[model samples]
Each structure stands twice: as structure tokens, then as C-alpha cells.
Target: SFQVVECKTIDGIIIRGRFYAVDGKGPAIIMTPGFNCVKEMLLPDIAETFQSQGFNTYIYDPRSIGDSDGSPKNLIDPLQQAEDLADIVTHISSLPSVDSSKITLWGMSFGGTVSACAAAVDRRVKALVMVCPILSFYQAEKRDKAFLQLIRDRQSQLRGNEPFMLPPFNSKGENPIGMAGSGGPGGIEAYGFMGAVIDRGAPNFRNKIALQTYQKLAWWQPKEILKLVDKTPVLMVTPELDTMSPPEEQKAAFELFPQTKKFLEAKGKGHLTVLSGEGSVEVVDAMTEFIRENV
Candidate 1:
């Protein structure tokens, strides 16, 4: 029913994923988890839910995170990760149990953004699904002043200096925390989101990413890559107001898709609540429907 898989990326990173293989060959949904979160939080129940719906599920931790290997440990590189997305689909497609032509790219949060970029340029994806995806790091930074300050401070620290890596989410110290340091008034949502992962299950979950990544990610604009998926159908999961990330960017990215794109919105659901708290199960139900209907 389930198996652990490991494969090498283009950059030679050993990416490990959990494959909930269905009874036989069927459509495959390869997940791209976001930020510092791993498949543990990204899938948890969602992956198996897809399995129950007759879709084989595959979710993994990108390099520099859980069960993988890479440099600048814990750095979140969108462009780099996009490349991995391509490699992952290729790897999954090669599997005997999966139908290469019927594969989909499912991204969560930041992973959704990476998936969009990958699916846009790489049509290997039969369809694309992103839940609470963040489109512009620059736009989000504008709202997260503490994080903005952290970026400025870290940028200064990185000048001819060794890489700066620290716990990603506290507001009080040098590392500050991820959202609270940058999340602004809504930074409190970090607790719910982070707690959902750490306090819940996620045995391999690694909450910390590179401190300099904030500065690096601030320059990422996946919306720029949105046009690539025009021919590929996209299924977007719009959360109730994503706490730290801007939902408008996700909507804007969704509008750019040229194919038949579908959206499932939960107005009352905040970032964590959307997928972790109350209305999450229904959202997964909708996700299953979207994949089955499309594939």
C-alpha cells in the first residue's frame, strides 16, 4: 500500500519520498512541499486521501531538508527547487506503477509556487495544483517588516561572511522567528501553522531554513513564470486568507493560466486552519475531485 522511495536530483541530491502506491498503475500526483516544511506536514493525511481516491500519491522533502542532501543546508531556492520538480516528475514517470502521461504536480504553499514555475516551463505535468501558494516574496516582504528588517540585517551579515543559518521562527532574538520576525500582525499565525507540523506528526520535519534565504527569496517572483502553464490545466487551492503570504498573488497567478483552471476557496480558513484545522478535510475532498475530474 505504501513504500519509501529515494532518487537523485539533477544536482545529485538524494531526495526521499513516501509513495502511497495504489493497487495498480493509475494517475500519479507528485507533491512539492513548501518553505521549510517537509512532506510530513505537506501531506500528512492529504497524500493518503489521494490514495483512497484511487490516485497514487508521492510527496518528498527537497534537498537541504529532510532525508536529502545539499549545501547551504536548509536554503529555500525556488528556481533550484523548480528544477527538482522536473526531475521528480521524470523519476515518478519512470516508475512501472505510474502513467507518465497522466501525472500531475501538486504544490503546497511555497512548493505550489515552485510547481507553478516548473509546470509552466515543463509541460510534463498533465495538470497543476497549488494550495495557499505564495507568488511574490517581494510583495510578502513589504507586509512583514520584522522579516524585512531581518532580510536587511542578514544581507549585511552575508557580505564576505560565512552563511547564516538559524531557527526560522522566533521574534525575540538574533534569528528572530520566521513569521513573527517578518509576519507582521498576522505573524501569530505562524504558531498555528508551525505547531500543526511540529506538535502533530512530521517525524522528519525540519522547521529551520537558512537565515539568508529570506533575503534570497525576497527576490523570487514566480508570477513571472505563470504564463508557462497556459496550455496546462491548473487546480488552485485558495485558502481563507493565508496568514503571512499574500493570497492576491495566488489569485493573480491563477488568472494567468490559459487553460481550464479550477479554484477551491475557504473564506473563513486562515493559513493553518485551511489545511490543518477545521475545513481541511473538505478541501482535500475537493482536491481529490479536481484530480479525478481532470485526469
Candidate 2:
């Protein structure tokens, strides 16, 4: 079991997380989940596994999207998200009980990109781990008309207008985050996979997202900032069949790291499965080993 704690961000958001109990020590891992995910929805097993191996895991809900607070709910902002992560690192590192000097940031998918970008400028982050990561919004979309319309909507957003919204996980809708990107077995599978998980228990999880999320991401490509990451040890995991984030885009991001980094791929796994399905055991174990070695 994990203990619950709520910490305030520099931006005044009260972020809640689960600290899977480990011997009170100096080293800890801070985890950020992706795309409307909460701590309970996707991170319990990871927390438990790592804690069982004697490491503490802190899993947080993105600001305003989970138990955390912020306005214009369901909005995704990579730039601010990176800042928020920097703030989180500060908070986690300041703790007297944690191995303040050995703090690591771990993110999955969208959050993975956020982790990389945040670690780029923040010297506090000792190591970083990205799972099924994204690099360029331009390449992420392998799309056409949907992409054009999104650009149009985003321009209007910058012109000081109401935000364009979409059902983020719908199969046949205008969810820019899903549609603007390549659909694994069509967008429907991504929707179906998430829906199955929500149907299981995450009823409080919101389903709508703003087009501004994609707009914000387009301007904050982590690849551009990756070279600034210095020589911090980085670990990236990619699944061979990943359709959601696309293996090619992940590879492109992986190459941007200027220094020490390790790439591990799951041969037959797809994006969702690599994250929450089979073969997760192997990847999780691999991730744990990477963190331990670097720390």
C-alpha cells in the first residue's frame, strides 16, 4: 500500500500523489502519467513493483486534469507542464527525507516529452526516463485535412477567441490530439483501449480536450531542447508496434539526446500494450534497473 500526500506547486496548484512506502531515504522517483490519466488509473502496479524493490515512487495527476487544480479543465500545455515539472522537482528534492540529490523524473508518452524538456534546463533532475516518448508535433501527426483544420483552429485561438474543443477519446470525432496523430488501427482502437480502462474504474476521468493542447505542443518540440540536456543519463523505451506515438517519432526523439542514453525496445508490443498490457513487466523491470543504475 502507498501513503497519500498533497503538495503545492509553485503555480499554486495542489498536486496529489501516492508514495508507495519505502524506507525513508534520499532517492525517489517522480512519475507523470499521460493524456487524462490519474495516479490510480495507470500507476499503481509501477509504484508497487518499484517500492517492493526498495524504491519510492511518486505518481501525480497532471495539473487540473486529475486531482490537481488549474483552470480550463482538460487543457494540455507542454510548456507550462514542463515548468510545473521543474517545480515538482524542486519540491521533491527539498524534502529532508528523500535522497534530495538523486531525484529522477519519469514520464510516459506526452509526459515523457515533458520530462525530457523539463530536464533539459533544470539541473536538479539527475536522470530521466521516457516511455514511448514523443518528440516533434510535426512528425507526430503522420495526417492531412485534419491537420490543416487543426492549424486553422489554433490560429484562431492565438487571435483571442474561444477554444475549440473535442472529445479526446472518441473514435469518430474531432479530437485533435488523437485525430491529428496517426491512429493505431484507426483512431478507434486508441479510443477503445482507453474506454475499456475507464469503464473499469476511472469514472471521474474527463474525456474532452482542447485543440490548444496540440497547438501548444507544436510550438514546444522537445527535440529542439533535447540538446540542452547535457550529459545526464537518459533511458528511452519503445515498443516495435507502437501506433499511437509511432516508433519512428520515438526514434527521432531518442537521437536528439546529446549525451549518455540507453534505448530499449519491446519487439512485438504496441503503444497501449507496451504501456498497460502484456510485456509491461519486462519494461517496468528494465526501467527500474535503469533508474537504480543511474542513481
Candidate 3:
């Protein structure tokens, strides 16, 4: 069964989330969505998968997105997102259906990066599942000149007072070629997927202030946290052809963790495909097994 729940964080932000509780009492898996995305966008399908395996699933929109209360909506801040995850975990741990000692955190894309940081700081998190996570902002510095040009052009438009309209991150919307860095061949398709999910009634884009705020977040690094933690197990799922968070980069990030961990690399999969395609099932299955073994 699924129910809407409101959790108030230490910072006084009230986060709205969906709680999917299965019949059997088991560990709870808290899911965090990617950057610029709402919790409802990806959590439904993923939570259903976890629920099928008899685990309680919790998914929420981070502050500034979906139903969460925050200023400058749609902004992505690493520290804020991590703090929200920690608060959500603490709240879930006290739920009647959850085993507080066996809580797991699952994050995708930017959320995955934030989850890594949250797991390190919160001793209550027993395990982690990171899917196509952004490990370092520094890696983005090496994006091709074409991608750089797109950013420049977009900025120019904004400066000129022209309405800057970029395609949805994952849609059939024609993402100006070379603009989105590395969204892959079916980038537009992925953007469409995101659009359909977020269309459930949240603002697709926040104000320019929110866009500028994201610039600062792009520099936040979570790999540093991996070096400081032990005991908590990690599972990193990488797509073989993911241009956004390349496999090699992901592997480098994973190597930094000195604790017990598992890495699953999906063949011929791009970044978003791993979330909804055949690869998604494989990745979810691996995560389920990992959680069972670790928690």
C-alpha cells in the first residue's frame, strides 16, 4: 500500500513523500531522484520493484522540487539534498514497518552522488545503491568544446533578454546539439520520459535565480566522503555507454571506497536506458540482491 506522508526536517522544510509499505516487516529503501527532477518522476517504478521484494520503500522530492517546500524552486544543492535524505532516513527509521537498523539508500544520477555523501555522514544508513551517479564535478570540466559552446550560447541568450528555452533533460524535445554535455544518442527520448513523469503538476523550470544556484552545486564533490566511511556497503551500477557519467569515471570513483562494495556494469546501455529498459531490471535485481546480503 502507498500513502502520502509529510516529514519536517531540522531546517524547517516540510518534504512530501510517498511511502510504499509491503506486508512483511523488512528493511526500508529510501530513494532520491536525480538533479532537477521530482521524486515522483522515477520513484514509482523503482519503489514498486523494491516493494515486490517485501521491502518498505520511501521516496520524496527534495526541497525546491515537486511538492517539497523551499525557496528558488528547481535548484539543485548537494548539501541541502544530502541533509534532506538524512532527515528522511531518520524519520523512516522510526516507522512501524521499518527496521531502523537495516535502512538502505538508493540514489540515481545527482541523487546518487548526494546519497554517497549522506551514507558517509549518517551512521544509520546500512547500505547504498548508486545508479549512474555523478562522482565528481571536475570530470565535467573536460566536456567537449561543442558542449562548451552550447553553454556559452545559452548564456548569451539569457544576457540578451531572450527567452532561453532548452529541451527538457530527457525528452524528444530537440536538445540543441552539443548543449547538454553528454545526454547520449537517444537523449531526446530520455527527456521525453522525464517530461511525462514531471508533468504530473510540478513546474518544469524554476526562475533564473534557480538556474544560477545550480552552477554552484555543480562544483560540489561527494567522492571525498567515500574515503571517510567504513562498514556501510555500496553498490554502484554503471551503464556501459553512458556518456553523462562514463563507465571509466564511475569505476575510478568506486575504487576510492575502501569498504565492501559491488559494481555492476550494464552492456550497451546509455544513461537513461538503464533506468527503464531491460538493463533497468538487471540493475534493480542486482541492487535487491546486494541489499539482501548487506542488510
Candidate 4:
């Protein structure tokens, strides 16, 4: 139901993805996964569901992750990923079965943050859907400390040392921020989800990430630019019980969008569950309607 596709970024990285096209031409939706996730983790099911609703959907793996080409696998930079997403927009717009002007950008977790950034900078995105986007994260002082550590880490890497690596999540007490966990509640839940996905057959999914990835994440505050999203229609989906990204922060960011916007609370859903959990169908239905209205 999908065709393997690739989009080359300006920096010459190849983003591997799958395009699910519906009959004829109508609206299209583009999506990528959350932090350290592969395209197959959970996006395929949602993309296929959107396809069934007569939408041309594309889901991809961000560079340095999954099958995508980039150095130091799992080194994620939100800004770079957003640029990669824009390049994907360019690739999808060129497809004959797509209505270039009627394109909706969709994303989950960190991918949602990238989508918001991309849409704000590129008017090509007619609509945007942010599913549990991490808008506000570590405080500035903490991020500043992370930045210094990143500099030190980079210095070592430049001196011929391998980049520092950390797991996306762990049962052992470590960094308890969803990725690189401490076996805390969030860690247990997130690890359970990713572990299930790995067992279910996404062998390309690796738990390791370059330590510098955290520095980049610390600098990412999409809430600061949400108001810059002037004209594009935006839809923000928040998991009611999301402990990872926090429901309050998501709702607050929703108020920053300058134009047409909506908020969907995935009642009883948690951070990872909102995508394919019990309330996912409603989220999809609302997304379909949002695209219908905007695109």
C-alpha cells in the first residue's frame, strides 16, 4: 500500500520513507516519528489509516536514524530535521498524485516540534498537526550546562575520540528523561513501548544516541516561535495523561499559534499511546477533518 521513497537533503543526506498514495489527487499529509524512532515504529499504521481516508500520506525516518543516511547514527537535531522535512515537502509536492497546494504536515513528539518549525519557516505547509510535541523543555540554566558539556564532548570527538553515546531509554537508573532512562515510571513505560516495537520486528531501531543530541534538544524551544506560525492552520493533539511532554505545556503552546488552530485532548491517553492507543482513532478522525478544512 506504500512505495519506498527517498528525499535528499540540502546537505546530501538521503531520507528514506514510504509514500501511501490514494486514488487520484487530493490532500496529502507528511509525517515522521518521535525522538529516536524509526518510520516503522508506529507511523505506518497511522499513515495507512490516513490513506484509507483518501489522503496521500508519507512517513519517513529522520536522518541518522532508521534507514536514513547520516553520520553518527541517532544524532538528532530538531532544526536540521525540520530542514530535512522541508526537503521532504519539496519531494512530495513534486509527485503527480499529490495536490501540492493542499499539503498538511503531521508529526508526533519531537517530529511535531520539527513540523511546527518547518511550517513556520516554509509557507508550503497548508496545515500542521502536532501530536504531543515537546515545545518547552529543560530550563535555560540547565540547557546552558548541557551546551558546555556538549562543547567538551565535541572537543573530545574532534581529538579523534568516538562521540559519547547513550541509550534512548533504560531499565537501569540513568537519565530519566524518556530517552536514557532511570527505570522510573516514564522510563518503564517508554522502554516498554520501544521494546515492544523492537520485538515486533523493527530491527533497525537502535537505542543508542549521540550524547550531543541532548544539547540540541535543550536549545529547542518551539513555543518561542509558535506565534511566528501566522497563517497556516494548526492542530495540536495532547495526551491527557502525557507525563513525558506534559499536557499543560502543549495546551499553552496551542494558544501561541497566531491563526486558525484547534486542540484535541486524547482523553486517557499517555505520551506514547496517543498515536496508536485507545483514543488514536478519534485523533485520526479529527486530523482528517482538520486537513479537510485547511487543505
User: What's the C-alpha lDDT at position 143 in model 4?
Assistant: 54
Candidate 3, residue 29: how far the Cα is off, in Å? 0.3
lDDT of 2 at 43: 71
Candidate 2 lDDT by residue in tens digits, 1-295: 8777677777688777777657777578889887667777777778788788877678887787877787777788877878888777776766656787787889887788788888888877888998887665443443455568777887897899777776665665235444324344625666775667667787557766776676666567567777778777899998798766779878887787777789999888876667667777888898878878887
Per-residue CA lDDT of model 3 for 90-150, tens digit only, reads: 7888888888889999998878888888888898999999988876543233435434644
Positional deviation of residue 96's Cα in model 3 after best superposition, in angstroms: 0.8
Candidate 1: tens digits of C-alpha lDDT, residues 1-295 = 6799887887678888899888778899988887787777757578888988888889888878887777878888888888887888888888888888889898887788888888877877878888888765443325476476666766676686656666655543223433322446445556445656767777777666676676656566566777767787888887766655667756777776778889888778765556777777888888778877777
Candidate 1: where is the Cα deviation over 4 Å?
Answer: 139-162, 172-183
Clashing pairs in 1: 147-181, 147-182, 168-178, 169-177, 169-178, 170-176, 170-177, 179-183
List, in order, the clash count of every candidate structure. 8, 3, 6, 3
All candidates' TM-scores?
0.86, 0.87, 0.81, 0.92
Candidate 4, clashing residue pairs?
A: 168-179, 168-180, 173-182
Local error of candidate 1 at residue 262 (angstroms): 1.0
Q: What lDDT does model 4 reach? A: 0.82
- Top-down TM-score ranking: 4, 2, 1, 3
CA-lDDT, candidates in order: 0.74, 0.74, 0.73, 0.82
